[PDB]
Symmetry: C2
Subunit: 80 residues, 2 copies
């Protein structure tokens, strides 16, 4: 599912950026850092079994989520 869910992100990327930029995600810088850890956190949990499933979706998720989050943050350079 994690592999198929990035497919619905094809327009989310363009839509998000096209729809706006300063309020595209409406996320805070502090929250961004916490969110990033969560994505990687799941990967570490899976690594424990020396075979993380989430790692597959993590790559796409981390990149996709980060691209959107950084997009808004980079647009205003600030969030507060």
């Amino acid at each position: 599912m994690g592999l198929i869910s990035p497919l619905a992100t094809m327009p989310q990327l363009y839509k998000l950026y096209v729809s706006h930029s300063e309020h595209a995600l409406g996320l805070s810088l502090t929250t961004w850092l916490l969110y990033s850890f969560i994505a990687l956190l799941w990967t570490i949990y899976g690594i424990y079994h020396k075979n993380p499933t989430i790692w597959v979706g993590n790559c796409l998720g981390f990149l996709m989520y980060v691209a959107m989050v950084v997009g808004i943050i980079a647009h205003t350079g600030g969030t507060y």
Copy 2:
């Protein structure tokens, strides 16, 4: 961590709604449905062991994520 990450959502809820509404999340209706399944999907996986850890964070995550997603969707009633 999932229990502590909702804490950084205290201003995200107000910030997101206050920051905007039509472009608060910039998410699509179709994506919203897929996203909802992902949250619940993790819960089902954990249920398999008759002890889901994510279930704890799932409640807060699902409610928090849904509240923001529905907020933008309900604001415009459409996303495209």
